């Protein structure tokens with residue numbers, strides 16, 4: 492469960508948030524494969540409620556109607572076509588599994604679903620599965636409202652409705668079996684793992700019972716005995732009885748403290764600074780590296796919907812964001828997930844975005860295709876951060892230095908720091924209000940290296956900054972606090 496099952500030398504996953512299956516299929520072939528990406532986290536592939544008020548919000552996909560692979564991203568055939576084409580070029584697919592609940596208990600009954608399946612929240616009937624009143628936690632939940640009211644009570648957090656979402660009785664073998672049926676079908680057609688949505692809201696033991704029913708990965712694409720990669724969504728910021736460690740027996744856990752803290756130090760909140768990052772990792776109260784799924788921002792908190800709060804850096808903060816993603820991809824801690832978003836009309840009023848519900852770019856509710864511009868950026872309002880040179884090159888940087896230890900750390904006691912990864916890579920950051928100009932020990936072999944942040948290595952030359960490493964491994968770095976990207980990165984494969 493702990494291993495991502497990516498092809499050897501592939502160390503990251505990209506969340507192609509709300510992308511259609513046909514676009515991901517193409518992306519795997521034209522970009523993800525040749526650029527060394529390990530895999531893709533796809534949006535929930537199961538049928539959900541079609542919500543019109545507001546108009547097709549992104550969150551409607553977290554309100555299941557059935558397990559039919561039929562959504563705005565595509566039908567069952569288009570989904571498998573995607574998994575097959577991606578696997579064929581060595582790029583994995585990870586499914587966002589929404590298995591804790593079905594839709595909101597107040598949603599009107601009918602066929603307002605992405606595949607037309609009928610469902611009646613009020614009567615607890617979802618015939619397409621099928622689920623009935625016997626499969627929900629109505630009787631088990633002890634709160635007066637029936638919803639989660641107090642997180643200091645680990646029981647209601649698991650047995651009551653998350654914001655009114657009908658809560659499945661995951662202790663029942665019938666329910667466990669219907670979920671396993673859905674997940675095994677996905678495994679058998681090729682998915683390499685799952686994001687277990689709302690895991691804090693499920694008992695560690697119930698998740699375990701469901702995982703016990705899962706098959707090994709498709710033996711045509713994966714080695715015999717491969718188990719699906721499992722990363723559970725648990726937002727654990729430290730002040731509750733439920734700890735993400737309670738879920739280690741099932742697989743990895745999302746480390747939401749990661750992006751939260753990286754955001755506060757890079758924004759320099761509360762006197763924090765990059766020099767403090769020398770002991771980044773468990774030293775900051777994070778889960779063990781081998782149990783962490785890390786990221787700077789997620790589809791949830793990039794729009795203030797989850798946790799990490801106001802400190803979270805996103806594509807909106809492009810300059811600082813690239814640097815944060817750069818530090819994450821260079822540092823050995825955890826398994827990295829990079830975000831790929833769509834632009835929405837963010838509109839702040841009293842410090843809150845009233846358009847944080849807005850769904851993916853669409854024409855009358857039909858998600859727009861991802862267009863690729865000549866400069867390799869995306870059109871149709873897809874941000875495509877994974878295509879930003881500064882990020883894509885750090886994804887490659889991570890692959891190049893994989894297995895190499897964190898070494899040669901340097902800091903000016905403020906916000907100018909640097910560190911290397913064995914003798915395969917080195918990165919330098921300047922987040923102070925003044926220039927950084929100094930000779931650093933890089934731990935790299937002598938030679939000329941292309942800085943992969945400002946440019947690229949192209950046919951024996953560099954398009955951007957060049958760094959010269961001497962025989963003792965030292966090299967001079969000069970970064971202005973006014974630089975477009977205040978950080979430089981070089982590695983074994985960017986050497987001329």
Ligand SMILES: *[C@@H]1O[C@H](CO)[C@@H](O)[C@H](O)[C@H]1NC(C)=O
Pocket residue numbers: 950951952
């Ligand atoms: C690098 O670029 C220069 C021109 O700027 C050219 O003379 C040289 O041959 C190029 N090197 C390679 C290896 O293509």
Ligand SMILES: [Ca+2]
Pocket residue numbers: 591648649650651658659692693
């Ligand atoms: Ca639950």
Ligand SMILES: [Cl-]
Pocket residue numbers: 724745789
């Ligand atoms: Cl997440």
Ligand code: NA
Pocket residue numbers: 496497498499
């Ligand atoms: Na392997």
Ligand code: NA
Pocket residue numbers: 688689724
């Ligand atoms: Na969630």
Ligand code: NA
Pocket residue numbers: 492718
């Ligand atoms: Na095992």
